């Protein structure tokens, strides 16, 4: 509930930033709004790439941290670790 709210707020702020900075380029804005024009399932599959080190996800490090902490708490509760 709160993880998705923080993610939504950040995705709105980043869209505001890209709409402010769209005047800089024409084709770079194209990749940048690829994320925003993608279908929601693809958007969230992209935003959920915190794992490993591929780093294509644009979500910030703190938001990565809450999910990485919840995931290890859940693994400890499941007994995998």
């Amino acid at each position: 509930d709160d993880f998705v709210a923080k993610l939504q707020d950040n995705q709105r702020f980043r869209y505001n930033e890209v709409m402010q900075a769209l005047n800089m380029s024409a084709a770079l804005t194209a990749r940048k709004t690829k994320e925003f024009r993608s279908p929601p399932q693809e958007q969230i599959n992209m935003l959920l790439n915190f794992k490993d080190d591929k780093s294509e996800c644009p979500c910030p490090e703190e938001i990565r941290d809450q999910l990485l902490d919840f995931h290890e708490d859940l693994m400890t509760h499941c007994g995998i670790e």
Binding site: V4, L7, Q8, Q11, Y15
Partner: peptide
Amino acid sequence: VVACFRMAPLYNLPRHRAV
């Protein structure tokens, strides 16, 4: 190109659908 760029934001969706 603004309307073409803006298609379906995730933040516009209600909370439960995003959850």
